[PDB]
Amino acid sequence: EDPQLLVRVRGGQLRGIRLKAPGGPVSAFLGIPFAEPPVGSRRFMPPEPKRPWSGVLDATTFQNVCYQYVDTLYPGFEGTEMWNPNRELSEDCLYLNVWTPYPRPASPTPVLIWIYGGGFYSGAASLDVYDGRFLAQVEGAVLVSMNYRVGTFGFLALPGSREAPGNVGLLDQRLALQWVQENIAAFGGDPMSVTLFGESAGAASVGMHILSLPSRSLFHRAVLQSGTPNGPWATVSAGEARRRATLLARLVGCNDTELIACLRTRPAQDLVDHEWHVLPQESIFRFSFVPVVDGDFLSDTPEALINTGDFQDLQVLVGVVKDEGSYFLVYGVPGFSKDNESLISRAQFLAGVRIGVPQASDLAAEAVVLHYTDWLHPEDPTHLRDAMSAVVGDHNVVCPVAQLAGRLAAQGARVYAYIFEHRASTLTWPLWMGVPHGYEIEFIFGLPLDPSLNYTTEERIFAQRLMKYWTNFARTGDPNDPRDSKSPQWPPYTTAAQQYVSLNLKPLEVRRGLRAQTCAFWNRFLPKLLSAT
Amino acid sequence: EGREDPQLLVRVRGGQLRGIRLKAPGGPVSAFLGIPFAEPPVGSRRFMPPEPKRPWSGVLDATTFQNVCYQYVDTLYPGFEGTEMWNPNRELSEDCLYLNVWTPYPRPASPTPVLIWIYGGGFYSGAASLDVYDGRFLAQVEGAVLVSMNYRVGTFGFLALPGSREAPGNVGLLDQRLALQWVQENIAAFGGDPMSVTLFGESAGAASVGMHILSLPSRSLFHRAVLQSGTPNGPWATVSAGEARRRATLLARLVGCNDTELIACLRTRPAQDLVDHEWHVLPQESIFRFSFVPVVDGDFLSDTPEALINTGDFQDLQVLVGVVKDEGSYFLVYGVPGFSKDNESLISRAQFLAGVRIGVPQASDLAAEAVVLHYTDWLHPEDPTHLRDAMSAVVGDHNVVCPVAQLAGRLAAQGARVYAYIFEHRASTLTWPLWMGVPHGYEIEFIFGLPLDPSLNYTTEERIFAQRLMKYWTNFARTGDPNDPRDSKSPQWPPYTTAAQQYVSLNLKPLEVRRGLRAQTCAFWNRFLPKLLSA
Numbered sequence A: 001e002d003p004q005l006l007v008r009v010r011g012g013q014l015r016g017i018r019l020k021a022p023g024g025p026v027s028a029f030l031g032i033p034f035a036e037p038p039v040g041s042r043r044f045m046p047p048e049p050k051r052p053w054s055g056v057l058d059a060t061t062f063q064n065v066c067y068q069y070v071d072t073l074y075p076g077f078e079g080t081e082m083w084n085p086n087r088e089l090s091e092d093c094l095y096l097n098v099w100t101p102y103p104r105p106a107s108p109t110p111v112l113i114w115i116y117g118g119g120f121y122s123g124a125a126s127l128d129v130y131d132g133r134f135l136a137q138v139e140g141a142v143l144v145s146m147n148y149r150v151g152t153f154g155f156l157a158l159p160g161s162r163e164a165p166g167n168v169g170l171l172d173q174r175l176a177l178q179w180v181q182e183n184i185a186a187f188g189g190d191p192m193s194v195t196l197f198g199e200s201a202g203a204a205s206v207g208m209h210i211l212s213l214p215s216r217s218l219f220h221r222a223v224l225q226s227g228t229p230n231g232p233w234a235t236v237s238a239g240e241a242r243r244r245a246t247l248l249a250r251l252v253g254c255n256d257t258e259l260i261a262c263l264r265t266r267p268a269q270d271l272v273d274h275e276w277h278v279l280p281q282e283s284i285f286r287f288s289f290v291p292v293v294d295g296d297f298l299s300d301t302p303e304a305l306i307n308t309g310d311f312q313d314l315q316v317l318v319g320v321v322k323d324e325g326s327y328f329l330v331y332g333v334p335g336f337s338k339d340n341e342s343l344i345s346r347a348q349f350l351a352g353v354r355i356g357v358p359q360a361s362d363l364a365a366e367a368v369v370l371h372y373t374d375w376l377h378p379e380d381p382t383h384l385r386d387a388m389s390a391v392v393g394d395h396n397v398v399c400p401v402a403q404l405a406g407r408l409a410a411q412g413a414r415v416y417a418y419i420f421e422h423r424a425s426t427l428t429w430p431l432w433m434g435v436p437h438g439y440e441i442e443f444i445f446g447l448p449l450d451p452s453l454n455y456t457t458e459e460r461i462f463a464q465r466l467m468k469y470w471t472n473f474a475r476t477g478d479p480n481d482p483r484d485s486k487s488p489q490w491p492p493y494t495t496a497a498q499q500y501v502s503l504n505l506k507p508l509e510v511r512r513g514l515r516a517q518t519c520a521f522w523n524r525f526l527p528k529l530l531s532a533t
Numbered sequence B: 001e002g003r004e005d006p007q008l009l010v011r012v013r014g015g016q017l018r019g020i021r022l023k024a025p026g027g028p029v030s031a032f033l034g035i036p037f038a039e040p041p042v043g044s045r046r047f048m049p050p051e052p053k054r055p056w057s058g059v060l061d062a063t064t065f066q067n068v069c070y071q072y073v074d075t076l077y078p079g080f081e082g083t084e085m086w087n088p089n090r091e092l093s094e095d096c097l098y099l100n101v102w103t104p105y106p107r108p109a110s111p112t113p114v115l116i117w118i119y120g121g122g123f124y125s126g127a128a129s130l131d132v133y134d135g136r137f138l139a140q141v142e143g144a145v146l147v148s149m150n151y152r153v154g155t156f157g158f159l160a161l162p163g164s165r166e167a168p169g170n171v172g173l174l175d176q177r178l179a180l181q182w183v184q185e186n187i188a189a190f191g192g193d194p195m196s197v198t199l200f201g202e203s204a205g206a207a208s209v210g211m212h213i214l215s216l217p218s219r220s221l222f223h224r225a226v227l228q229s230g231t232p233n234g235p236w237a238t239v240s241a242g243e244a245r246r247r248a249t250l251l252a253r254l255v256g257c258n259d260t261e262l263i264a265c266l267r268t269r270p271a272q273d274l275v276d277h278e279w280h281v282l283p284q285e286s287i288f289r290f291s292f293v294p295v296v297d298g299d300f301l302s303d304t305p306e307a308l309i310n311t312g313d314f315q316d317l318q319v320l321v322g323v324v325k326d327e328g329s330y331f332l333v334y335g336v337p338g339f340s341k342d343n344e345s346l347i348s349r350a351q352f353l354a355g356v357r358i359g360v361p362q363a364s365d366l367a368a369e370a371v372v373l374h375y376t377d378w379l380h381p382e383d384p385t386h387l388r389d390a391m392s393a394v395v396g397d398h399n400v401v402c403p404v405a406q407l408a409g410r411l412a413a414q415g416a417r418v419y420a421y422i423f424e425h426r427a428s429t430l431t432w433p434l435w436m437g438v439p440h441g442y443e444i445e446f447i448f449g450l451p452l453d454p455s456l457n458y459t460t461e462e463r464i465f466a467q468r469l470m471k472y473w474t475n476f477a478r479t480g481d482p483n484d485p486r487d488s489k490s491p492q493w494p495p496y497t498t499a500a501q502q503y504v505s506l507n508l509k510p511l512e513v514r515r516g517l518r519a520q521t522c523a524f525w526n527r528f529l530p531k532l533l534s535a
């Protein structure tokens, strides 16, 4: 009974496991319950604090992954499977993991809380890419990750109802943050220095915690990687959530109270079966059950909230990867596949745009096509392919991120921005997808430090660099190594200068304007095209 | 005759002409100036088609330029060369339908290629007698027969009651067509080859050239065409029949006036009255808009130029087209608040938004928003220098550069041999400020070879440059190809194609080949903006 692996939290005792990281041991506490299992009558409902437990709860193993769609587009392919559940599915999934240095830190240590992506329909804190051992070992970071409900279970709302208020997945996260405030000191984490970080939907979730007052007392800093609360995909209106919930119910054979009672009687997989048959249009980067603008958790739209919010005593790190949109195209854009080079035609491109920007009118779609057509090579297949990728990445990530960075900086935040441009050597996706959505995570988490993963020496040093930026940010609100001069400084992002840095194998390069012209098209023009028409 | 220079006595269909031996730098040229090609379009003939000049008797003196067609005289900057060079340089009179011929001296033995100049001036001004249209250098240095003609401008050439007998519109264009006919019949008298006639013109001259391309009865009258910074298509060169009716009726009201009764009243008005009100008839506050322009009459122009270039068969056609670096800069001082020749014209974002409304007077709110969006540099959205240049670009692109791209594109796609240029050399003698760059109209002096006149103070490189340009142009006139078929050292000027979109830079440096004529930006004006404005 190693006394370093034995901790007492408000609910009782836990016993972790000593895990091996390349440069030494780390204490891991895996599958710590933070909520009552949200099962039976508690499906679709807000989480409640886990009741205390007797004796020593075994926290040496990852708990169940929340009930979700499992991906089958490319069975047995590592590129898709790395995002697939790696533990048993179960509605009983409200668990969090903690990694600390071994021995557990002597002084209060900054806490990083990870919030996975997965389009609000999938994900799990237990994937290899979110492994906290390296950050814990190399940087001395106390790292926390939590499971939160996804799909219908986390996000199906009948807004205004008592039994499906919506945003419960987000409340799952909030409860885990609450859990951190109350318990992390026991692990030698500093509750007064909690940085949230997340990618894709996890990034949108971080952004919603920024935009939701009761979350603000629970962290001091945020990192949003390739995702935002604003933009086309991260939220739906009350009216729209009701409609999909209503539609899914009918689809599974089901007054709010009565409708929800019936949904609660259905096996999990039944709801997941028809999850994807509620989207209003054929569309990539669109997700059935996502956070709802409820006038509660989110008092207004994220757009409204970031335009008017006061972000003065807040530090934010935000960024994107070089090819945000490539990944998504192979999920229903004709002409796109991982298996060939996906050189498309002009016609495939116009049809592709109606899917990538599914909310767009004929006119708006035309505006898009005409903006993204390189007019010197109008029908070049490489150009059209790369442009399709760009349309989707810009619409869904880069421009919402630029939009967020701008508003936050204008309104008092300290903002640091990046673009991630190193394609992992081990990437199993074809070359044309470039640096796809999500392939920066393994690097931030420090996976290349595991010599058995066959990442290049260079990639290992890169990963060390990134872990340093992220943890320096966690530590100070500033990603710069406060002992260094060689390698330029990472300047804050501002609305004036619009400075961001490229993250890749070369030293930091400062660039200005993050797709400034193209994001002006998305953030300023297209709205007007739809608000008048 | 008897004691006169035997090289200066020519006969044409209407009689005998005495010309004048002129001194050019490399030797003498024959000039026949002020040859009437039409009955004076006066009195009851104002607004009417030109009637062919009735034969005269005796020897017509053709040794001086004739009257300039009645027109508005620019006063914006009194004393200033930059504006005066464009102002009438002979008496203003409605009796102005004369033309000029420059040939070698002595006149060539074998028939030589004819270049016919059609001057610009927005269809409200111009004269074939301005110094920058001096045909002597092209005549002396390239052995060209150069012909230029006056055509009625403003109301006299373009006021139209479409459908009426007494003011059918496009008569200015018909003046041009009459001089083309005169060339067909008479040019061989001068050693000109009527079977090798190249039209070239700039701005409204270029637009004019393009309308001859687009109007079948003019097609038989020339073989090759040069359009300099102007096109029959685009937002300024034509008006709908309805809009010309509107402008003409309104002008009539303004001066005190059944179409017959109205036109008859207009004909009783002094010429100067019409000029005094010609600017009071435009629908919006605008620059690069002109009141009385070619009308889409279903006669001269059987459809809109856009429709005709979209669907025309241009198989035989050889066309040279291009633009100056800063097409728009000139126009900004003529009524965009903020802009002037006397300072750097650094403007505010506000002045930019307002300038866009004036520069694109046909744009709805959303359309203008799009323009502003497209031309703003979002790195420095408030920068006065960018905003100034952007304002220029907007006006330049919308009126000239993108029309030329649309034209070049359509013509190429439909059988034409198109050669394309961007002229980027700023005259060392330019009197406009530096910020205006290479303004609209400032390639003309080079094509015409003025720098060859050592009294004009052009640099030696400009002299060599002018010669180069004269060579490009007259080769194109001669062959349909601006390239020198010998000189293979010099980089070749490739045709412009939809595939490769090649055009050449014209400046002091040897030819450079570039691809795409503001391709991205012109897709906005040519492909997107129309679609917007269907909403």
Ligand SMILES: *[C@@H]1O[C@H](CO)[C@@H](O)[C@H](O)[C@H]1NC(C)=O
Residues within 6 Å of the ligand: B455, B456, B457
């Ligand atoms: C050209 O230069 C000479 C220099 O002696 C000067 O006297 C003359 O006024 C100049 N003329 C022009 C065209 O400006």
